[PDB]
Amino acid sequence: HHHHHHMVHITLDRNTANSWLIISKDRRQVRMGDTHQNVSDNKERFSNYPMVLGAQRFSSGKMYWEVDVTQKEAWDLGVCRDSVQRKGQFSLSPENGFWTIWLWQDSYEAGTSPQTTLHIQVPPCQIGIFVDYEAGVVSFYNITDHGSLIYTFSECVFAGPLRPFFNVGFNYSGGNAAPLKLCPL
Ligand SMILES: O=C(NC1CC1)c1cnn2cccnc12
């Protein structure tokens, strides 16, 4: 690709975070805590899953950012509608306002309904996420493998402002404590 020049500075929005997440002072890293993080509940917080949104809202243009996933067993990344459901159980699908990929149990999948098998030869340590609002496109790139394409959602129906979306995953195994980190430009 050649999308790096639409690079945007993403930061995490503490107020949207699940109450077990720990966001770094610079708002560029997030990890699962071993307990509730002593914050009040609010209507923005994802209740059921270890999710958090970026602070930035996008309604036009082309946007690109990169996320470090080093040594994680499980995660979800992409974008979502600002109006996605926060409370209770839900599936990650474009019908529910999410454009995502994930790692789960040694397989990578795109958040279609039903989910789509990805073919990645080089397990990624960093993921690039590209959004073209006007074109209706969300694309994912393997930064570890010279920027190779992972997946493209096209004909997307955003139907409102978009926010960067993150899921650090549960850590039942003790092997998924590592953070998600927004990578420098
Ligand atoms: O964005 C959408 N689809 C594209 C990404 C694959 C999309 C969002 N809601 N919805 C409802 C019916 C059909 N397609 C949709």
UniProtKB/Swiss-Prot annotation:
It is found in: Cytoplasm; Cytoplasmic vesicle, Autophagosome; Nucleus; Cytoplasm, P-body. Autoubiquitinated; does not lead to its proteasomal degradation. Deubiquitinated by USP4; leading to its stabilization. Autoubiquitinated. Residues 8-185 form the B30.2/SPRY domain. Induction: Up-regulated by IFN. Signal peptide: none annotated. Homotrimer. Component of a SCF(SKP2)-like complex containing CUL1, SKP1, TRIM21 and SKP2. Interacts with CALR, CUL1, FBXW11, HSPA5, IKBKB, IRF3, SKP1 and VCP. Interacts with SKP2; the interaction with SKP2 does not depend on an intact F-box domain. Interacts (via N-terminus and C-terminus) with DCP2 (via N-terminus and C-terminus). Interacts (via C-terminus) with IRF8 (via C-terminus). Interacts with ULK1, BECN1 and with ATG8 family members, including GABARAP, GABARAPL1, GABARAPL2 and MAP1LC3C/LC3C. Interacts with TRIM21 and SQSTM1/sequestosome 1. Interacts with IRF3. Belongs to the TRIM/RBCC family. The coiled-coil is necessary for the cytoplasmic localization. E3 ubiquitin-protein ligase whose activity is dependent on E2 enzymes, UBE2D1, UBE2D2, UBE2E1 and UBE2E2. Forms a ubiquitin ligase complex in cooperation with the E2 UBE2D2 that is used not only for the ubiquitination of USP4 and IKBKB but also for its self-ubiquitination. Component of cullin-RING-based SCF (SKP1-CUL1-F-box protein) E3 ubiquitin-protein ligase complexes such as SCF(SKP2)-like complexes. A TRIM21-containing SCF(SKP2)-like complex is shown to mediate ubiquitination of CDKN1B ('Thr-187' phosphorylated-form), thereby promoting its degradation by the proteasome. This is E3 ubiquitin-protein ligase TRIM21. It comes from Mus musculus.
